[PDB]
Short mmCIF file of C-alpha atoms in Angstrom, two decimals:
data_model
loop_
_atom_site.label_atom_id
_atom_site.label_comp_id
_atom_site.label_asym_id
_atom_site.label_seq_id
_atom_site.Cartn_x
_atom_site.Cartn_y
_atom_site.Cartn_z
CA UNK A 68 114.00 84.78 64.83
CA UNK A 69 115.30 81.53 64.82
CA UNK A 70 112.39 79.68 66.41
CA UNK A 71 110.19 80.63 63.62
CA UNK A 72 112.61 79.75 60.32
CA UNK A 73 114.18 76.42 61.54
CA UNK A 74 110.34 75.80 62.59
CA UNK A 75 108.81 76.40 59.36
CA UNK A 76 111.13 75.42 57.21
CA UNK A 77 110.63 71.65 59.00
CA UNK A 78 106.79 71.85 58.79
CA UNK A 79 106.26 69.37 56.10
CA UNK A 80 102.70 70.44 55.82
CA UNK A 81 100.64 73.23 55.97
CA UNK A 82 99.16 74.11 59.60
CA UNK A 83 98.69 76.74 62.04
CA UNK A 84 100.32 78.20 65.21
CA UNK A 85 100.14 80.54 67.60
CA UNK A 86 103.03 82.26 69.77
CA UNK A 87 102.44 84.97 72.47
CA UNK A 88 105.06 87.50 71.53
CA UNK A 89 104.88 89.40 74.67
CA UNK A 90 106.29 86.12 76.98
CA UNK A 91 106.02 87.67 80.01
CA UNK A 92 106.47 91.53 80.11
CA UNK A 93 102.37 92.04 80.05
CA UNK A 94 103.03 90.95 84.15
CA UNK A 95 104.77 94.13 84.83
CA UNK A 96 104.05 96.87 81.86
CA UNK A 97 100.90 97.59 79.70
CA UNK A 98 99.99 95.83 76.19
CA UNK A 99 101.03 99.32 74.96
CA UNK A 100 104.34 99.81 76.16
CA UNK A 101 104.85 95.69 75.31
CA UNK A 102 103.50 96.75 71.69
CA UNK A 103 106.23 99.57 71.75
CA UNK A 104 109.40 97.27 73.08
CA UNK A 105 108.44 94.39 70.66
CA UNK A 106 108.07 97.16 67.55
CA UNK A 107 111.45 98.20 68.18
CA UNK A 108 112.84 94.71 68.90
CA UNK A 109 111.32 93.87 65.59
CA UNK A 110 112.93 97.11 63.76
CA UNK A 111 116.34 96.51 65.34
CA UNK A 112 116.20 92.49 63.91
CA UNK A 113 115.36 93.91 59.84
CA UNK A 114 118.02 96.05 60.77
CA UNK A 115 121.24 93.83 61.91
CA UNK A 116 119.92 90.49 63.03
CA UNK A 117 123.46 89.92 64.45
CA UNK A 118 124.20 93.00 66.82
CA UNK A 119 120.42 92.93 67.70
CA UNK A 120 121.06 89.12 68.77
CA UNK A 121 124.05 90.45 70.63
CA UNK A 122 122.34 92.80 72.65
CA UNK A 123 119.24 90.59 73.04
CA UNK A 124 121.41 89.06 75.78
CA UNK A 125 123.95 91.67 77.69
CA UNK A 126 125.29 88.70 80.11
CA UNK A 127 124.86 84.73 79.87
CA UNK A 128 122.83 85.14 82.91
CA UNK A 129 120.27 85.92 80.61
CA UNK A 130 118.68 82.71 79.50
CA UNK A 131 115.76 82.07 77.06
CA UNK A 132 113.67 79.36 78.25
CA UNK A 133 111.83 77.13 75.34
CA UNK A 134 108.46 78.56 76.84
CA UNK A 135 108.84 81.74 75.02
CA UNK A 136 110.56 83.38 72.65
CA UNK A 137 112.36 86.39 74.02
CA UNK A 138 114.52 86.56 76.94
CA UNK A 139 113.96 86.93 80.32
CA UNK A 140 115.30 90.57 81.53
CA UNK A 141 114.94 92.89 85.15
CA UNK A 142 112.97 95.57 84.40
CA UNK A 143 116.34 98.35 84.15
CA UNK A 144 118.21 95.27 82.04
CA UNK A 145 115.34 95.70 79.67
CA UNK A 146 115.51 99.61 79.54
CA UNK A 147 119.15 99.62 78.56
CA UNK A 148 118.57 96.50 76.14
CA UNK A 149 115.81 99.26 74.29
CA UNK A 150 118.02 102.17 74.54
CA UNK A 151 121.02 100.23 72.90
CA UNK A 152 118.67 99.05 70.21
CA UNK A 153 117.39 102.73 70.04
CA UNK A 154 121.25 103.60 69.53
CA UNK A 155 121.43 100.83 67.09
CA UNK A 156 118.73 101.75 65.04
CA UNK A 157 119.90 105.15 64.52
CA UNK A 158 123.17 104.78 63.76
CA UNK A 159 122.65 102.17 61.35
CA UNK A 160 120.37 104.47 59.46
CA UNK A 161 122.83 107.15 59.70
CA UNK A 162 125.50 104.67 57.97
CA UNK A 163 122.87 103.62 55.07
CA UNK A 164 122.09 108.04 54.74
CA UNK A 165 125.48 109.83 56.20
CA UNK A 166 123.64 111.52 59.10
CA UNK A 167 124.63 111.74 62.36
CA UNK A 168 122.42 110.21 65.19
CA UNK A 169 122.46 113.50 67.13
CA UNK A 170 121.74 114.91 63.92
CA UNK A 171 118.07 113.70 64.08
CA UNK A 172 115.54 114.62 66.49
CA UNK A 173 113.01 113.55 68.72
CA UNK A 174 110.10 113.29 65.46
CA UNK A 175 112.68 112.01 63.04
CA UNK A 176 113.68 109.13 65.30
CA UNK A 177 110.10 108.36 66.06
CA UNK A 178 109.36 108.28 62.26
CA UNK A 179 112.62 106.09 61.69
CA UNK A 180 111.82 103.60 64.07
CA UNK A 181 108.50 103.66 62.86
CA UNK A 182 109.73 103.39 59.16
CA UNK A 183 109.53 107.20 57.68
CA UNK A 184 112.21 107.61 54.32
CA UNK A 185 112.76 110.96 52.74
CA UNK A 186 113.54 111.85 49.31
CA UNK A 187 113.23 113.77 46.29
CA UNK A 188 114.09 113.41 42.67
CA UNK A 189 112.32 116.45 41.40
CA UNK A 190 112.81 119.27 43.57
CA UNK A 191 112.55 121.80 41.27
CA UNK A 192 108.61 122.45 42.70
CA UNK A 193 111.15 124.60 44.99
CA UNK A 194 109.55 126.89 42.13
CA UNK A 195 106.41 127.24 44.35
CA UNK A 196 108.08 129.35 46.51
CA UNK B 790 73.49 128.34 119.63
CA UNK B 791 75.04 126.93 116.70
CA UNK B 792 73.43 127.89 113.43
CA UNK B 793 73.68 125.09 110.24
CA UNK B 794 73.48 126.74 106.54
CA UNK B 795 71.48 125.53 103.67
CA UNK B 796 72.80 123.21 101.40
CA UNK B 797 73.42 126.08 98.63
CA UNK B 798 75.34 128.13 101.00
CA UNK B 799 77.54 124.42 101.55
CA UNK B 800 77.89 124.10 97.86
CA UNK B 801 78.82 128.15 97.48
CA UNK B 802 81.40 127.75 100.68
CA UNK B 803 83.24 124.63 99.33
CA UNK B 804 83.15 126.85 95.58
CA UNK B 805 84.72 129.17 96.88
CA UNK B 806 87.19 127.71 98.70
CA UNK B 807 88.10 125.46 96.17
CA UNK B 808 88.54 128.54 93.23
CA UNK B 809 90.90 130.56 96.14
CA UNK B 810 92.95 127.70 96.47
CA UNK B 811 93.10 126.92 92.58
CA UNK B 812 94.12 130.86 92.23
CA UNK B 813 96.46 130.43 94.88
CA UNK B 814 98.11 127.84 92.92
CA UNK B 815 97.64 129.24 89.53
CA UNK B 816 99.43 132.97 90.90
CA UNK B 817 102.10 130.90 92.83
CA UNK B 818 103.23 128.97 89.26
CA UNK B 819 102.45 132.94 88.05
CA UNK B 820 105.60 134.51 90.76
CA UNK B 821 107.84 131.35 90.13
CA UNK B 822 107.68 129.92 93.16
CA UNK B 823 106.16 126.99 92.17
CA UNK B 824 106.70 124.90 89.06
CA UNK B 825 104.59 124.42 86.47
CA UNK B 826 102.22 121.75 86.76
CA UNK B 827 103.25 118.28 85.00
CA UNK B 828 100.59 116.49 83.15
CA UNK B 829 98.86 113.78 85.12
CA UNK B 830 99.75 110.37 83.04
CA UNK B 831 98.04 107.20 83.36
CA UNK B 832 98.19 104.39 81.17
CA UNK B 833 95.47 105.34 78.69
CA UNK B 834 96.96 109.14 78.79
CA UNK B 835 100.66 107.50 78.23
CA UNK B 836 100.13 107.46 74.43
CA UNK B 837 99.17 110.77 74.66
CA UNK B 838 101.47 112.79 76.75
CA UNK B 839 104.73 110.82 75.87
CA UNK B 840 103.52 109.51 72.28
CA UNK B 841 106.37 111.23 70.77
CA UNK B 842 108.47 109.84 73.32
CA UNK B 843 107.38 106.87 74.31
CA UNK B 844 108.72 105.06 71.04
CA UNK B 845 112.09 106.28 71.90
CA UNK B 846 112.22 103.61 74.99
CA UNK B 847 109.03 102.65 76.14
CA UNK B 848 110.11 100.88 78.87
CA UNK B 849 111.32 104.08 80.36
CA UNK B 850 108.47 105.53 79.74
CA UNK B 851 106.35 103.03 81.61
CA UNK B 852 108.48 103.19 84.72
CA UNK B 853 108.41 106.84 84.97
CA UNK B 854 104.53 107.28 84.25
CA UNK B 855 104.33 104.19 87.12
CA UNK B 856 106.39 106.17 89.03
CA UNK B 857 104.13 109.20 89.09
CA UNK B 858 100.96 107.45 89.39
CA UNK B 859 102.27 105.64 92.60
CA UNK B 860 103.73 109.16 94.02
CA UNK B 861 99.76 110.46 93.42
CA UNK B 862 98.80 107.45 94.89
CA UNK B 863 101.19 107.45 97.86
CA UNK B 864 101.17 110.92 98.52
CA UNK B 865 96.74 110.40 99.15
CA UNK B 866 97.87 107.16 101.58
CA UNK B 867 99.91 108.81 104.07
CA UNK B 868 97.37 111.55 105.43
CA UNK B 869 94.56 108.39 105.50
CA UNK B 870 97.12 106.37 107.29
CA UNK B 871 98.31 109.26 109.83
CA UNK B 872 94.49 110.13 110.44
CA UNK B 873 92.99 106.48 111.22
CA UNK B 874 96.25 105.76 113.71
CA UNK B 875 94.32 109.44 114.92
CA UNK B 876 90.96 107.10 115.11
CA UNK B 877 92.34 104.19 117.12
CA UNK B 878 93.74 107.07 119.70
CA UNK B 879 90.49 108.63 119.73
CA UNK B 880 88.34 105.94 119.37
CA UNK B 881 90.23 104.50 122.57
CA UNK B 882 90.02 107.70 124.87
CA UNK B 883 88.39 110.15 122.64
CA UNK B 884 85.86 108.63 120.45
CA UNK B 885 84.56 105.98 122.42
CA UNK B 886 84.59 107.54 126.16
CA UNK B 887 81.83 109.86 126.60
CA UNK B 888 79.76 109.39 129.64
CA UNK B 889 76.93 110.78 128.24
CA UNK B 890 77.19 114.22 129.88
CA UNK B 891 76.00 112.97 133.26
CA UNK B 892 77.25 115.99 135.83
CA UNK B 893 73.67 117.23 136.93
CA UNK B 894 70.89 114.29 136.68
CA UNK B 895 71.46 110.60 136.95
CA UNK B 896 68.71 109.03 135.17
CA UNK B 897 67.70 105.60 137.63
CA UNK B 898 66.28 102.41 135.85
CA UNK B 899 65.54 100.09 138.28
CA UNK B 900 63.59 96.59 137.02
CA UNK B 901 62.29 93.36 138.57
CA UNK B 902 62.65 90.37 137.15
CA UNK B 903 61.15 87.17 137.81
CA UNK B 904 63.78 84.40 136.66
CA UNK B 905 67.22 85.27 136.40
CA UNK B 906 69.09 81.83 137.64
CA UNK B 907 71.31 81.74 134.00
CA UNK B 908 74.72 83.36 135.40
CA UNK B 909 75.39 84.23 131.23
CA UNK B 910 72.67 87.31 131.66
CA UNK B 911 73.65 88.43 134.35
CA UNK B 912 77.47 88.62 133.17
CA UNK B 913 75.97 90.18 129.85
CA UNK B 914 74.47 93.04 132.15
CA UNK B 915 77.32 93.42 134.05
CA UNK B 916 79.85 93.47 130.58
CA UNK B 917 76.84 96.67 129.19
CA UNK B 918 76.95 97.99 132.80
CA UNK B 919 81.03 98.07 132.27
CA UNK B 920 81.20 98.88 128.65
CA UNK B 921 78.37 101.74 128.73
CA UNK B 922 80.33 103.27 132.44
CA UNK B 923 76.64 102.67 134.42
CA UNK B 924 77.03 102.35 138.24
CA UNK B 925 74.34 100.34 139.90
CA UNK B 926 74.30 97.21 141.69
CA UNK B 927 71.93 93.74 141.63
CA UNK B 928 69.75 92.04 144.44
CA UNK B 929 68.62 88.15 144.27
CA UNK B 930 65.84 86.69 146.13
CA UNK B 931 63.48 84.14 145.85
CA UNK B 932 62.08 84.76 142.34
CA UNK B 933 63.31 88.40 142.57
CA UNK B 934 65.85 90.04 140.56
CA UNK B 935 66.18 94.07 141.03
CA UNK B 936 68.50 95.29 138.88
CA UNK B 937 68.85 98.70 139.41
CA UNK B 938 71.33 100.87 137.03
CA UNK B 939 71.69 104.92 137.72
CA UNK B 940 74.14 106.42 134.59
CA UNK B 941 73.45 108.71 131.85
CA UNK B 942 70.22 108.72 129.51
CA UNK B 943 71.79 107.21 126.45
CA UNK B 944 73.28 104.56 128.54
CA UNK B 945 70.17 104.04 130.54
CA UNK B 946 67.94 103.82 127.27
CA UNK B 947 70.87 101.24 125.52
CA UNK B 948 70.24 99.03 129.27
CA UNK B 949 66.33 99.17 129.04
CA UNK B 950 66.44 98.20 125.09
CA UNK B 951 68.73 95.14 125.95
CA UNK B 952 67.07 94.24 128.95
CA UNK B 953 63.74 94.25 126.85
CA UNK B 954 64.54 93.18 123.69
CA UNK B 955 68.43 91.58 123.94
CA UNK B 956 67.56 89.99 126.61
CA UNK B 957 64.70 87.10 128.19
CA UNK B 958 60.14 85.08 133.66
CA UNK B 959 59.73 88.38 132.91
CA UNK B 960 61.34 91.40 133.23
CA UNK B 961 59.27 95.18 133.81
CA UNK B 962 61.22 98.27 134.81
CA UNK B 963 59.92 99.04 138.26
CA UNK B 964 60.80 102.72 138.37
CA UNK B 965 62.48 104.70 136.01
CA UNK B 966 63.40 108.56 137.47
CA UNK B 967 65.73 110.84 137.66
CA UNK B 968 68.04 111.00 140.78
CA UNK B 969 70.42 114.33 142.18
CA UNK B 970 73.83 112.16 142.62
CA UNK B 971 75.12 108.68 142.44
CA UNK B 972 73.32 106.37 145.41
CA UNK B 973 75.08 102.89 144.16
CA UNK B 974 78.80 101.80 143.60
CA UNK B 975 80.19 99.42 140.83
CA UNK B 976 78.37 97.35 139.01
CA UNK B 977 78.05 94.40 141.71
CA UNK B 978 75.41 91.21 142.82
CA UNK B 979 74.36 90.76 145.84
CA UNK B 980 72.61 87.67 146.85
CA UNK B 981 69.61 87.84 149.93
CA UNK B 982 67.71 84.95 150.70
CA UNK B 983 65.87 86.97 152.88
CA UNK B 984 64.17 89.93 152.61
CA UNK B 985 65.36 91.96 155.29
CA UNK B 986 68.80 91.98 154.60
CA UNK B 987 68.03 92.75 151.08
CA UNK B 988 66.02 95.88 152.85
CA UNK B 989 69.35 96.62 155.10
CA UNK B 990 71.11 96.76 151.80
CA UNK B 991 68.94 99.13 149.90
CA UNK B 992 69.05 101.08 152.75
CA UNK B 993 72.63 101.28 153.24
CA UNK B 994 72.42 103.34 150.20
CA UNK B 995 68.51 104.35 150.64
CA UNK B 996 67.00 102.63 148.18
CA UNK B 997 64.48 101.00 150.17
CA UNK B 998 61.56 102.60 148.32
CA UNK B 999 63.02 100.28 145.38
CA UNK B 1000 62.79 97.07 147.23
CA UNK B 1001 59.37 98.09 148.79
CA UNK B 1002 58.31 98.77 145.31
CA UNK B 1003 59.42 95.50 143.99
CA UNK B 1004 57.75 93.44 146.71
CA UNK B 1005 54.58 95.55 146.27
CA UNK B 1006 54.33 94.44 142.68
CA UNK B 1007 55.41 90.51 143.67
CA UNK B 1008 52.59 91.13 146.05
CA UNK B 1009 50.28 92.43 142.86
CA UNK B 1010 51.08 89.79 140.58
CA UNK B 1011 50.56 86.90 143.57
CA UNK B 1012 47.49 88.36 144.04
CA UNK B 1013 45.61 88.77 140.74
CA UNK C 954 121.47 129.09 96.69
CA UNK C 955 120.44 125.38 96.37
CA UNK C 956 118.67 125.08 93.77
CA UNK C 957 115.55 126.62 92.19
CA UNK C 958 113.66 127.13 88.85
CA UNK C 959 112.42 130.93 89.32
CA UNK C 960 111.23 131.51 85.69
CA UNK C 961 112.65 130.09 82.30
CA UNK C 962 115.68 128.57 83.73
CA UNK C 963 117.27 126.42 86.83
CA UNK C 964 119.11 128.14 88.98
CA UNK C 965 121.38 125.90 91.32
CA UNK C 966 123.90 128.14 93.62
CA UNK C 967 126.43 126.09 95.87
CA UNK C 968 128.07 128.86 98.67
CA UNK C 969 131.69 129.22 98.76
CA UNK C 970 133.05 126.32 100.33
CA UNK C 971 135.51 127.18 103.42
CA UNK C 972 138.73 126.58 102.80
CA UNK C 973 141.34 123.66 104.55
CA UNK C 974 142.37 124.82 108.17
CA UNK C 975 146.45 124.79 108.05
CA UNK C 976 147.55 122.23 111.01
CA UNK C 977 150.20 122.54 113.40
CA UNK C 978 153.33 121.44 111.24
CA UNK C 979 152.08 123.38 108.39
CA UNK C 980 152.10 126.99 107.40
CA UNK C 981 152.54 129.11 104.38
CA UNK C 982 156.46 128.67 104.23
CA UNK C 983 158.22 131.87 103.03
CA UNK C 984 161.10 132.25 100.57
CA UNK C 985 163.80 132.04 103.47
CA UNK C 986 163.95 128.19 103.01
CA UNK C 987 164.23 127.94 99.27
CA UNK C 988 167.69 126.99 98.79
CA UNK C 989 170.07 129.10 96.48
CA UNK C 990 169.15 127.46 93.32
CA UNK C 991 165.20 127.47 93.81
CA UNK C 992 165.49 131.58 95.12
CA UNK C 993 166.40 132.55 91.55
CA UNK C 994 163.10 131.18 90.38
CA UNK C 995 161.08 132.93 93.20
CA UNK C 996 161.94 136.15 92.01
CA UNK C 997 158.99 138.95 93.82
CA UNK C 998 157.44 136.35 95.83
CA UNK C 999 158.34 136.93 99.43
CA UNK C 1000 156.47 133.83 100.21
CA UNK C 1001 155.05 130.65 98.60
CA UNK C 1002 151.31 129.05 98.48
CA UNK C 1003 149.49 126.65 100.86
CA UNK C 1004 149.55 123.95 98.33
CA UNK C 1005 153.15 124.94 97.10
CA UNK C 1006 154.41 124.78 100.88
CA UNK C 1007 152.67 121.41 101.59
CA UNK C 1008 154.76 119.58 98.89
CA UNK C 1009 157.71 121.58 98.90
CA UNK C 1010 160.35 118.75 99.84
CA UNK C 1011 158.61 116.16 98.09
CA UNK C 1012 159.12 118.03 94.61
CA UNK C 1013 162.25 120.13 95.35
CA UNK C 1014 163.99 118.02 97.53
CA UNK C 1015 162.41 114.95 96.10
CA UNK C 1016 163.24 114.03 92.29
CA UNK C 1017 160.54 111.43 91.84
CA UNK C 1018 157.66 111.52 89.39
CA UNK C 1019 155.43 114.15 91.32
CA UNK C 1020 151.17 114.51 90.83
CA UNK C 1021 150.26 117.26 91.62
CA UNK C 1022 146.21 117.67 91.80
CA UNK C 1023 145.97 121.38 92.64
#
């Protein structure tokens, strides 16, 4: 994020901060659901860092105040914000494994957002069966 | 008569309704006319129900889980709502106007006091004479107040506990009876300097036994 | 009809909708007032459609582009 880089890499001595990563949202939705939002916001950033900045804002209406971190959304603006990071997400692992998006389901997106990798260089313990 | 049940056969009754209307339910989902129940989702069930889901877009998620926990809510508000506009109807015309049942006996207080100049008491007794629907009427004289209120027995024993205790010279209920029909009109003071037309007043009614009473016991407390 | 879920499956049934109620200057027209080059082409069809009799000039008669959302 660049409020944390630029401010670190400035900090000519050692120190500590603190941040409240959910800005606002706690007002209107529960720590878990703010939890949930800022784990995917996070995913989608180690992901692209440049279409998730893009959809970070959807208008220039959308302004991030030097309060907080994140930007300020309505409630439905942040809904489709998460579901086009969802998409996001997805298809970017489907370019880095040559899967389709629909291809996955509801489990295997869960576990992808979450972080879940599958592979096998010996599968020749197919000789259990 | 009526006849009131024991508290078992309460608890048994409410059982029993309760399991008829949870099989009614239950056999209704069973025939397809009704769907099958949704999980009830709050906040700390959100993680549960729509775990697998909820990571998908939790805002969504939130919304819709707010969104059934305020139709619950709601849907409990609007019968409580409907029902307590039902209480200020009632409560205007139906919960609040009584009359005590008085149809066959009038139940007669009638009281002498000794010092009743403050006009604040005697517009207290007349706001409990209006509020409580207790005819009667009032008589001043020289150190003589008889207050005399014919109503109902609830009403009569709410105007002898306020006159006795609500209110402050002394005041004694001179004769307290039961009377066929209704001798006074509204609730109404009448002020007689002298003690005959006081007595042509009581009798206009005939309630003169009431003013001979009180002026027999002004007569026994001048005496002794 | 409506719509229902009775068991396993959503059922949703619209009723037949009625149809358009033809007007005073419009009918089913027949083939009498095809001219000679369009009777060829309406060969066993003694008369024509609602919908082919509503924009009969404006795509016989007529050579512009025509659209016709039938």
């Amino acid at each position: 994020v660049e409020k944390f880089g630029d401010l670190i890499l400035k900090a000519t001595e050692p120190q500590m901060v603190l941040f409240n990563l959910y800005d606002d949202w706690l007002k209107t939705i529960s720590s878990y659901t703010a939890f949930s939002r800022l784990i995917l916001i996070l995913r989608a950033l180690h992901v692209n860092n440049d279409r998730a900045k893009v959809i970070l804002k959807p208008d220039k209406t959308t302004i991030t105040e030097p309060h907080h971190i994140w930007p300020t959304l309505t409630d439905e603006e942040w809904i489709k914000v998460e579901v086009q990071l969802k998409d996001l997400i997805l298809a970017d692992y489907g370019k880095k494994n040559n899967v389709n998006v629909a291809s996955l389901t509801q489990s295997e997106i869960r576990d992808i957002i979450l972080g879940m990798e599958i592979s096998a260089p010996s599968q020749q313990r197919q000789q259990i069966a | 008569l009526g006849v009131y049940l024991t508290k078992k056969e309460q608890k048994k009754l409410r059982r029993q309704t309760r399991r008829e209307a949870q099989k009614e339910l239950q056999e209704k989902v069973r025939l397809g006319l009704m769907p099958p129940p949704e999980p009830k989702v709050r906040i700390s069930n959100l993680m549960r129900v729509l775990g697998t889901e909820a990571v998908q877009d939790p805002t969504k998620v939130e919304a819709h889980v707010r969104a059934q926990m305020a139709k619950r809510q709601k849907a409990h508000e609007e019968a409580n709502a409907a029902r307590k506009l039902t209480a200020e109807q009632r409560k205007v015309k139906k919960i609040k106007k009584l009359k005590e049942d008085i149809s066959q006996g009038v139940h007669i207080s009638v009281y002498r006091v000794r010092n009743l100049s403050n006009p604040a008491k005697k517009f207290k007794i007349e706001a409990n004479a209006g509020q409580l629907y207790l005819t009667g009427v009032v008589v001043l004289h020289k150190d003589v107040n008889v207050v005399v209120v014919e109503g109902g027995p609830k009403a009569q024993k709410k105007f002898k506990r306020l006159m006795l205790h609500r209110i402050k010279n002394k005041c004694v209920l001179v004769w307290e009876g039961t009377a066929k029909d209704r001798s006074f009109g509204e609730m109404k003071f009448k002020q007689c300097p002298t003690e005959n037309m006081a007595r042509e007043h009581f009798k206009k009614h005939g309630a003169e036994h009431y003013w001979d009473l009180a002026l027999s016991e002004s007569v026994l407390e001048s005496t002794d | 009809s409506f719509r229902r879920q009775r068991k396993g499956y959503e059922e949703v049934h619209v009723p037949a909708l009625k149809p358009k109620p033809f007007g005073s200057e419009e009918q089913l027209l027949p083939v009498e007032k095809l001219p000679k080059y369009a009777q060829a082409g309406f060969e066993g069809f003694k008369t024509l459609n609602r919908i082919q009799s509503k924009l009969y000039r404006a795509a016989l008669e007529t050579d512009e582009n025509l659209l016709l959302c039938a």
